[PDB]
Swiss-Prot record, chains A, B, C, D:
Single-stranded DNA-binding protein that may be involved in the maintenance of mitochondrial genome stability by preventing break-induced DNA rearrangements. Belongs to the Whirly family. Residues 11-16 are annotated as: Required for ssDNA binding. GO terms for cellular component: mitochondrion. One of its GO terms (biological process) is defense response. The gene is WHY2. Its main location: mitochondrion. One of its GO terms (molecular function) is single-stranded DNA binding. It is found in: Mitochondrion. Homotetramer. Assembles into hexamers of homotetramers upon binding long DNA. This is Single-stranded DNA-binding protein WHY2, mitochondrial. Keywords: DNA damage, DNA repair, DNA-binding, Mitochondrion, Transit peptide.
Length: 161, 161, 161, 161
């Protein structure tokens, strides 16, 4: 069933990985199949301990929706994006936990910094994992994300077979 | 058999969705299969009643042909398109019903307005559903539509398997 | 076995269609499969007789190789290409028959003219089928051809399945 | 099992070919499958002996990683790349053998030169295979490599099926 093949970037302070998560479908009794739980592109950040040694137990995740992916793949050399996620957004527990993912270009255009910030007011913690990403590394993402977008949207269920 | 996974945009005045409809094939007796009923990318518009509440019963559709899709995916930030459809085009009942879909950019380049106008002289009605679409949302469409184009054209039947 | 789903453009003087032809493989005894007869993108031109009536019996073909496809999909608004094919190229019967396909832009950038010229010195004939192609129509080709390129190259045989 | 369909360029001094090599997976007992041995795009160079006659026995290989592919597909007309590979990189036998692949544009922008240099201090040899590649030929590579990137990354294992 399960499948694992993330694209990973391992840098000085932290490690970064990315993988699609396909949407789930509830087969209706009326016939065929219907899309249920949304697909995303999952990003995982985690800290470096030893030199090129990382603590997988301190990992934090950030799910990119289809639209956030569209925003990413349409970034030029000089562009930035910032996405803001509250796992408990739109309720009383909103504000307790805030995740913000930012993607900023270097002044020289030699790549980007992809940073995940996690503020937890419940646990009283404040984490920031930053991973530099080269122009070529980021090209791999745009291309792979672009490939995966239709799949996470469930559009690959439309083939003439 | 059937498959449902539209990409949807829900805004103030109306909701917008899009999904490929694959072409149909009549298997000839001579052998193989032949393309019959054309594929399109189907757009569905429908009105907002309550706040983020929409009336699916007042929905109107607009089928984009392969060529109209090509026109869409090749739109720059500052481009516009207008497509004109008469469900009874090229007969006496032509003019009775007119659908026009327009896609116009915002002055600031923060996205587009995608509007469906429906004029029915038979029922004496005049409807206009407008849905704003962000740069990123529109990027999702171009990419998904681009992915689907070969499939709606029936070209995916050409794989080495 | 066979599969038919060309993309077609029907204009004043002639009709134009395009479809991939997949490569053939000779399964070696040593194991697996090996690519044999090359894939191409086949273009078919044929004359208009009545208004929107065409003579399929007077059709002429032009096979685009992978590299010619690469040349096509990488054409800008103002670009041209000309391809020259001798069905009996590189022998004594070379020169007997010459096919040249040209793709030229309109001055206004509203599209292209795609023209097939066929000179037969054996039969003493000289044919020229010209078909105007809009910006959007040509966008459909670039996208569909681009999709098909890996398939006609046989690269789709490399999937993780 | 095996599959062969390289894209090949045959020129004056040497021949060049390219083909994806898919990644390998070790099916875990816990369930599903996990990516193991990395995918690459394999380049093979080999010398010309007679006119359009080549010595396959003197071939040298250069494996492009996913990231090197990303660097390639994101090359403009005026760009260059150089990749440096030591088959025994990061050990005592490092430096014994060095492979460098370069891709340089022509002054006129009529294409590129793709050159593999192999220095072997063990055997005391110094080889350089150079193959000119046209704009259109290089367009075929970018497109085919781009198609294959997700497959060599193992992302095609994520389809809704």
């Amino acid at each position: 069933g399960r499948v694992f093949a993330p694209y990973s970037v391992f840098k000085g302070a932290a490690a970064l990985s990315a993988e699609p998560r396909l949407p789930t479908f509830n087969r209706l009794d009326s016939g065929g199949v219907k899309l249920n739980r949304r697909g995303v592109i999952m990003l995982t950040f985690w800290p470096s301990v030893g030199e090129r040694k990382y603590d997988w137990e301190k990992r934090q995740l950030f799910a990119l929706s289809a639209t956030e992916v569209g925003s990413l793949i349409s970034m030029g050399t000089r562009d930035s994006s910032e996405f803001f996620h509250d796992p408990s957004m739109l309720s009383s527990n909103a504000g307790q936990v805030r995740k913000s993912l930012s993607i900023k270009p270097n002044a020289d255009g030699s790549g980007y910094f992809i940073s995940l910030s996690v503020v937890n007011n419940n646990l009283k913690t404040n984490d920031r994992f930053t991973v530099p990403v080269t122009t070529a590394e980021f090209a791999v993402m745009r291309t792979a994300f672009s490939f995966a977008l239709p799949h996470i949207m469930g559009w690959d269920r439309f083939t003439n077979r």
